[PDB]
C-alpha cells in the first residue's frame, strides 16, 4: 500500500522507518545501539530535542518490557514517531466564510509562491471563488509574477505600487473580496529575513488592520517551509510562530530529499497542524497531510 507516497519518500526511507531495519538486524539492545540510533535520527534532521525525547522514551520502554533484541525497537519507534505526526493531523477547513482569509507567511522561495497557486487552483476545483492579495509589496518582480499568474488562471489579484504598505494592500483586498462575494482570499506577505524585527512588526500590523473588517480574520495563518532545507525549516517555523500566531503549516519538497525527517521536528517542537505536504509538481501533489498514511509509507518495507 501507499506506493506513491513510498516513492516520494524513497530517499528518506534510507535512514528512517524501513531504514531502521538494517540498523537493528542482529543487534542487542545496549548503550551502543541507542548511540547509533541517535546519530541516525540526527543525520535525518529529526533535531536534537525531538531525538532526545524519542531515545528517552524508547530506552525506558525497552528496559521496562525487558526487550533483548534490537528488532523489537522497530515497532516501538513506529508507535512513538507515529504519535508525533498524529498530534498534528488536522486538515484545513475553509468553508463558510465571506471570505475565508489565509495569511501566507514564510521566507521567500519557490515553496510559498507555488503553494499559493496550487491552493487557489484546488479551491476553485472545489467550487470556490478565490482572490489573491500581493502583500509582498517591495519585491516588484514577485508582485508581477503573481499578477501574471492571476491573469493566466483568471483569478483576481489585488496589488498596489512598489513599496506600498502591505497592511493596506491586504485591507483593500479583504474589502474587494467581501464586495465581490469571494469565498477564499489568500494573502501573500514579505519573507525577507535580513531584518527580523521589521518583518515581524509588519506581520503584526497586517493582522491588526484586518480586524476592522472582520474580527475573525485571518482565519488561517499558514507557514510554508521547505523540507529540503533541513533545520532551517525549524528555525523559520520558530521565528514566525513567536511573532505571529501560526495555525497551519505546509511542508514542501518532501519528494526526492533525504531530509524528510524534519517533519518530526516541526511536529514535535511546535504542535501546529500540518495542513498539506508537497510530494510532487502537480497541483494535486500538494496533498492534505494524513499522519497514518505517512507513517505507514515510511515504515512499511513492502511496496
Among 93, 125, 126, 151, the residue binding K ion under the rule CB under 5 A is 151
Is 180 annotated to bind a ligand? Reply is: no
Verify binding: residue 148, K ion, rule CB under 5 A: yes
Verify binding: residue 113, K ion, rule CB under 5 A: no
Verify binding: residue 252, K ion, rule CB under 5 A: yes
- The percent of the chain in helix, strand and coil, each rounded to the nearest 5, is 55, 15, 35
Q: How many residues bind K ion (CB under 5 A)?
A: 6
Helix axes 262-270, 73-86, angle to 10 degrees: 60
Instruction: Give the shortest CB-284-to-K ion separation in angstroms.
Output: 13
**Of 6-14, 147-155, 181-189, 256-264, which part binds K ion (CB under 5 A)?**
147-155
Is 190 annotated to bind a ligand? Reply is: yes
Q: CA geometry: angle at 108 spanning 102 and 112, to 5°?
A: 40
Residue with cell 537493528: 24
Among 51, 113, 114, 189, the residue binding K ion under the rule CB under 5 A is 114
Verify binding: residue 122, K ion, rule CB under 5 A: no
Residue with cell 498596489: 160
Instruction: Closer to K ion by CB, 164 or 283: give it.
Output: 283
The whole-angstrom separation of Cα 126 and Cα 294 is 24
The whole-angstrom separation of Cα 177 and Cα 179 is 5
Beta strands in the chain (DSSP E): 100-105, 130-133, 157-158, 184-187, 220-226, 248-252, 274-278, 286-288
Q: Give the cell for residue 61.
A: 520502554
Q: Give the cell for residue 206.
A: 497586517
**Of 52-60, 154-162, 175-183, 247-255, which part binds K ion (CB under 5 A)?**
247-255
Binding mask 256-285 for K ion (x = CB under 5 A): ----------------------x-------
Is 106 annotated to bind a ligand? Reply is: yes
Instruction: Give the shortest CB-147-to-K ion separation in angstroms.
Output: 7
Instruction: Give the shortest CB-167-to-K ion separation in angstroms.
Output: 26
Going by the DSSP 8-state scheme, the letter that residue 158 receives in this structure is E
Q: CA geometry: angle at 36 spanning 33 and 37, to 5°?
A: 85
Instruction: Give the shortest CB-23-to-K ion separation in angstroms.
Output: 31
**Of 2-10, 80-88, 151-159, 241-249, which part binds K ion (CB under 5 A)?**
151-159
- Closest Cα to residue 231, out of 29, 33, 28, 46? 46
Q: Give the cell for residue 53.
A: 525525547
Instruction: Give the shortest CB-227-to-K ion separation in angstroms.
Output: 10
The whole-angstrom separation of Cα 72 and Cα 166 is 54
The whole-angstrom separation of Cα 239 and Cα 37 is 29
Verify binding: residue 43, K ion, rule CB under 5 A: no
Is 188 annotated to bind a ligand? Reply is: yes
Is 163 annotated to bind a ligand? Reply is: no
Is 215 annotated to bind a ligand? Reply is: no
Instruction: Give the shortest CB-160-to-K ion separation in angstroms.
Output: 18
Verify binding: residue 229, K ion, rule CB under 5 A: no
Is 137 annotated to bind a ligand? Reply is: no
Is 97 annotated to bind a ligand? Reply is: no
Residues belonging to the chain: 303
Is 150 annotated to bind a ligand? Reply is: no
Binding residues for GTP: 106-113, 188-192, 252-255
Binding residues (CB under 5 A) for K ion: these are 111, 114, 148, 151, 252, 278
Amino acid at each position: 500500500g501507499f506506493a506513491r507516497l513510498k516513492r516520494s519518500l524513497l530517499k528518506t526511507k534510507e535512514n528512517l522507518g524501513s531504514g531502521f531495519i538494517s540498523l537493528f538486524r542482529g543487534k542487542k539492545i545496549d548503550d551502543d545501539l541507542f548511540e547509533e540510533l541517535e546519530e541516525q535520527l540526527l543525520i535525518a534532521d529529526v533535531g536534537v530535542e525531538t531525538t532526545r525525547k524519542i531515545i528517552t522514551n524508547l530506552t525506558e520502554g525497552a528496559s521496562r518490557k525487558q526487550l533483548r533484541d534490537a528488532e523489537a525497537l522497530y515497532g516501538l519507534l513506529k508507535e512513538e514517531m507515529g504519535e508525533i505526526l498524529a498530534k498534528v493531523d488536522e486538515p484545513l477547513n475553509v468553508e463558510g466564510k465571506a471570505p475565508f482569509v489565509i495569511l501566507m507567511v514564510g521566507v521567500n522561495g519557490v515553496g510559498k509562491t507555488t503553494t499559493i497557486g496550487k491552493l487557489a487552483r484546488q479551491f476553485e476545483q472545489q467550487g470556490k471563488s478565490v482572490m489573491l492579495a500581493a502583500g509582498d509589496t517591495f519585491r516588484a518582480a514577485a508582485v508581477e509574477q503573481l499578477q501574471v499568474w492571476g491573469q493566466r488562471n483568471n483569478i483576481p489579484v489585488i496589488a498596489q505600487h512598489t513599496g506600498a504598505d502591505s497592511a493596506s494592500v491586504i485591507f483593500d483586498a479583504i474589502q474587494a473580496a467581501k464586495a465581490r462575494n469571494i469565498d477564499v482570499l489568500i494573502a501573500d506577505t514579505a519573507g525577507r529575513l535580513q531584518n527580523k524585527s521589521h518583518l515581524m512588526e509588519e506581520l503584526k500590523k497586517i493582522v491588526r488592520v484586518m480586524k476592522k473588517l472582520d474580527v475573525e480574520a485571518p482565519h488561517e495563518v499558514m507557514l510554508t517551509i521547505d523540507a529540503s532545507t533541513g533545520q532551517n525549516a525549524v528555525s523559520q517555523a520558530k521565528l514566525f510562530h513567536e511573532a505571529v500566531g501560526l495555525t497551519g503549516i505546509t511542508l514542501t519538497k518532501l519528494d526526492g530529499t533525504a531530509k524528510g525527517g524534519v517533519i518530526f521536528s516541526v511536529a514535535d517542537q511546535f504542535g501546529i497542524p500540518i495542513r498539506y505536504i508537497g510530494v510532487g509538481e502537480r497541483i494535486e501533489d500538494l496533498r492534505p497531510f494524513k499522519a497514518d498514511d505517512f507513517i505507514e509509507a515510511l515504515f512499511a518495507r513492502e511496496d
